[PDB]
Amino acid sequence: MTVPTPYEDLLRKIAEEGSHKDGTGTTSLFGQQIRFDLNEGFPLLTTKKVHFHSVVGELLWFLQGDSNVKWLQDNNIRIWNEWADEDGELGPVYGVQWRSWPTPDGRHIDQISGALETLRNNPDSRRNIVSAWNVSELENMALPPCHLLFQLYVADGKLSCQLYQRSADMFLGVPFNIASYALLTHMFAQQAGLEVGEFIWTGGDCHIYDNHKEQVAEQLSREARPYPTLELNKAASMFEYSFDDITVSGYDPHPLIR
Amino acid sequence: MTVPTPYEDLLRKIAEEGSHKDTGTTSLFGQQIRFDLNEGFPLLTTKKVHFHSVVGELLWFLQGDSNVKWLQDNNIRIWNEWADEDGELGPVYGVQWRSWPTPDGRHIDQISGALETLRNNPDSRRNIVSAWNVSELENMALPPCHLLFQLYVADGKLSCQLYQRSADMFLGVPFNIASYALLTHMFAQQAGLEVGEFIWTGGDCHIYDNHKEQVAEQLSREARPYPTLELNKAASMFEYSFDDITVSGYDPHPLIRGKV
Numbered sequence: 001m002t003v004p005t006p007y008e009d010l011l012r013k014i015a016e017e018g019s020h021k022d023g024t025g026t027t028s029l030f031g032q033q034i035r036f037d038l039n040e041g042f043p044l045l046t047t048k049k050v051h052f053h054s055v056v057g058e059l060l061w062f063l064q065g066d067s068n069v070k071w072l073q074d075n076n077i078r079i080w081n082e083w084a085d086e087d088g089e090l091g092p093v094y095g096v097q098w099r100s101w102p103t104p105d106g107r108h109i110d111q112i113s114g115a116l117e118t119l120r121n122n123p124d125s126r127r128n129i130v131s132a133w134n135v136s137e138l139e140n141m142a143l144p145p146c147h148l149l150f151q152l153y154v155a156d157g158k159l160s161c162q163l164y165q166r167s168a169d170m171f172l173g174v175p176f177n178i179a180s181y182a183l184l185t186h187m188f189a190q191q192a193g194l195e196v197g198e199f200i201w202t203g204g205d206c207h208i209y210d211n212h213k214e215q216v217a218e219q220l221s222r223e224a225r226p227y228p229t230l231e232l233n234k235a236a237s238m239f240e241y242s243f244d245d246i247t248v249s250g251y252d253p254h255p256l257i258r
Numbered sequence: 259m260t261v262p263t264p265y266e267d268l269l270r271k272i273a274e275e276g277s278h279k280d281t282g283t284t285s286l287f288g289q290q291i292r293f294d295l296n297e298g299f300p301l302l303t304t305k306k307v308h309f310h311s312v313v314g315e316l317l318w319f320l321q322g323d324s325n326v327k328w329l330q331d332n333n334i335r336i337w338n339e340w341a342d343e344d345g346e347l348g349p350v351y352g353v354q355w356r357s358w359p360t361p362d363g364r365h366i367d368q369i370s371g372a373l374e375t376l377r378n379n380p381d382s383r384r385n386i387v388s389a390w391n392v393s394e395l396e397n398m399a400l401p402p403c404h405l406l407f408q409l410y411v412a413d414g415k416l417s418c419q420l421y422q423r424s425a426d427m428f429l430g431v432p433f434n435i436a437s438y439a440l441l442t443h444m445f446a447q448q449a450g451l452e453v454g455e456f457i458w459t460g461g462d463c464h465i466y467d468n469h470k471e472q473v474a475e476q477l478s479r480e481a482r483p484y485p486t487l488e489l490n491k492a493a494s495m496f497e498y499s500f501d502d503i504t505v506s507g508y509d510p511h512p513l514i515r516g517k518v
């Protein structure tokens with residue numbers, strides 16, 4: 001009464017008032033913001049089929065902090081393949097910065113387990129930040145980080161997460177990005193015994209490619225169903241979740257577009 | 259002829275809807291403010307914002323120095339409590355902007371890089387500048403607060419989004435807006451671009467308790483039109499001087515005072 005549509009709302013807004021940049025064309029707006037109350041449903045979009053298994057597998061692998069694509073393939077996820085080299089290696093992308101941001105001693109920082117310690121010990125911390133925008137290592141990455149930083153925050157025993165995402169393919173990328181951080185934020189809350197607050201997605205260039213005009217125009221005509229809800233069995237730590245611990249229930253998306 | 263007040267709007271929202279905590283704060287997380295820069299210079303008029311200091315800290319960031327000295331020599335004491343016997347701060351803000359240390363022993367000038375791509379690849383969706391150098395955090399007197407920003411070009415107009423992890427809504431934020439707005443102006447002038455929006459996205463946006471009355475006083479004032487920024491095209495991004503930056507037609511309500 002009704003179902004919130006912060007995503008489709010932004011989707012629409014860009015199509016109507018985005019300006020046009022020019023190897024295929026786009027219409028963009030800059031600096032937008034989406035937010036979901038996580039208690040209020042799991043934000044896996046229903047106006048089109050968002051494949052959740054790959055959302056989950058990417059995340060578990062981000063969390064392993066490994067830069068070889070193997071474990072994805074071994075688990076039937078090929079979304080990173082095209083960027084891998086012959087040996088299946090991508091450079092120090094997302095997970096690698098997250099678990100092992102290198103320092104000029106011999107060592108590395110684990111911002112994930114870092115971030116966890118400060119949830120448990122200091123929830124009011126105003127500096128609970130993970131970053132993958134490691135300026136000095138970008139040259140070595142297959143692809144410069146897109147969703148490049150997020151911040152954790154606690155109010156009334158409820159965890160919120162904000163994501164800064166530099167560039168957003170509204171149609172193909174975003175929905176997938178938001179389901180992935182919504183899940184990570186659920187994992188964080190569970191591993192520190194807290195309820196879930198909001199996920200805030202904040203973007204730079206939020207864009208629709210010209211070749212999505214018809215597809216977007218379509219999704220935009222469908223009415224939303226209620227969001228599914230997330231079922232999460234508690235693993236022993238952030239780094240020991242498996243596919244079996246993670247399911248959505250009551251997910252009834254409209255059919256895929258594309 | 260209505261004056262947008264997104265800053266005050268957020269202030270109002272935090273006071274009305276925020277979440278209290280324990281020297282205490284009331285807070286909201288993940289908030290955004292935008293100004294149309296072509297609509298004037300976002301120097302608050304619901305209270306006198308000191309500008310010379312804003313301009314001072316910026317020039318300082320941009321010359322990229324660990325030391326506090328240039329600021330002392332120009333009557334800016336605001337970083338004095340943080341610096342050691344030598345006036346040294348560690349590789350805070352400006353050191354990362356101009357010389358983010360590479361593992362191959364070099365340094366990345368991000369400001370130059372950003373300008374370079376404003377000029378050569380304006381469409382680029384990767385024009386990032388960051389101060390959040392995880393590996394240097396611990397050498398910093400203070401961890402970066404306004405910690406990354408992105409540039410973007412729409413229709414010849416330049417826009418800037420700042421991500422700021424933590425926000426003293428009353429005391430620090432108005433300086434932060436002024437500073438970044440002036441910053442985006444400097445980028446645009448040099449790139450030969452016009453000005454679009456400035457966007458302030460914050461993480462933990464709080465009003466400190468010891469500022470309740472100061473905030474109600476401010477909220478109680480009808481706002482005045484923003485001054486306009488007169489900026490004189492210096493030779494590079496790094497050649498700007500106080501002579502170069504003034505604000506005209508600035509009509510603020512009386513100074514409101516708070517401490518930390």
Ligand SMILES: O=c1ccn([C@H]2C[C@H](O)[C@@H](COP(=O)(O)O)O2)c(=O)[nH]1
Nearest residue numbers: 146147167168169173174177383384
């Ligand atoms: O997690 C991601 C990664 C990439 N993209 C999209 C946005 C851009 O269209 C493209 C990245 O290209 P550049 O912004 O670097 O040009 O991929 C996303 O939407 N989400």
Ligand SMILES: O=c1ccn([C@H]2C[C@H](O)[C@@H](COP(=O)(O)O)O2)c(=O)[nH]1
Nearest residue numbers: 126127403404424425426430431434
């Ligand atoms: O540019 C700045 C730097 C700091 N702060 C505020 C936010 C916090 O109240 C305090 C920084 O302290 P921590 O959040 O890191 O504890 O100062 C600002 O408002 N603007």
